[PDB]
Amino acid sequence: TNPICKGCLSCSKDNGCLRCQPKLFFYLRREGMRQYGECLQSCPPGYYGVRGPDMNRCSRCRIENCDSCFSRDFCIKCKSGFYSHKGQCFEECPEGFAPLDDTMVCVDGTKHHHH
């Protein structure tokens, strides 16, 4: 289908939106091998919304093993089998920290080891 260019301040002929209305989130979509600017009310899964200094945008979550990003560097929810710890995703909680198996986070534990 041919994209209709919506919620937009500058609509182009062949590239969708070039500048969204202030409140909408700019999103770059691929149709028939072309890139189209779209203006979304909320970003879709795999992205996070952020207010940049130029516009609201949907940025791609690139954290390894992350399901949902809070921001570029912080994962809110990791994929299956991973624990979140300081915004990253771990198969095992690191030294000093203990797993909570119902929420899949790492929390403060002991640093003592027997000699």
Residue numbers in the entry: 36 to 150
Paper text:
Rspo (R-spondin, also roof plate-specific spondin) proteins are evolutionarily conserved from fish to humans and have well-documented roles in a broad range of developmental and physiological processes resulting from enhancement of canonical and non-canonical Wnt signalling. ZNRF3/RNF43 specifically targets these Wnt receptors for ubiquitination and turnover, hence reducing Wnt signalling responses. Direct extracellular interaction with Rspo proteins inhibits ZNRF3/RNF43 activity. Here we report a molecular level analysis of the ZNRF3/RNF43 ectodomain structure and its interactions with Rspo proteins.
Sequence analyses suggest a putative domain structure for the Rspo proteins comprising two furin-like cysteine-rich regions (Fu domains) plus a thrombospondin type 1 repeat domain3. We therefore engineered constructs to express the region spanning the two Fu domains of Rspo2 proteins from several species. By using a combination of heavy atom and molecular-replacement-based phasing strategies, we determined multiple crystal structures for Xenopus (x) Rspo2Fu1–Fu2 (highest resolution 2.2 Å), xZNRF3ecto, zebrafish (z) ZNRF3ecto and mouse (m) ZNRF3ecto, (highest resolutions 2.4, 1.6 and 2.0 Å, respectively), plus complexes comprising xZNRF3ecto–xRspo2Fu1–Fu2, mZNRF3ecto–mRspo2Fu1–Fu2, mZNRF3ecto–xRspo2Fu1–Fu2 and xRNF4F3ecto–xRspo2Fu1–Fu2 (at 2.1, 2.8, 2.4 and 2.7 Å, respectively). In the crystal structure of the isolated RspoFu1–Fu2 protein the two Fu domains arrange sequentially to form a ladder-like structure of β-hairpins. Each Fu domain comprises three β-hairpins rigidified by four disulphide bridges, similar to the cysteine-rich regions found in members of the epidermal growth factor receptor family. The connection between the Fu domains shows considerable rotational freedom, allowing a 50°–60° variation in the relative interdomain orientation. The N terminal of the two domains, Fu1, is distinguished by the extension of the second β-hairpin. This prominent loop presents a solvent exposed methionine (M68) at its tip, which we term the ‘Met-finger’.
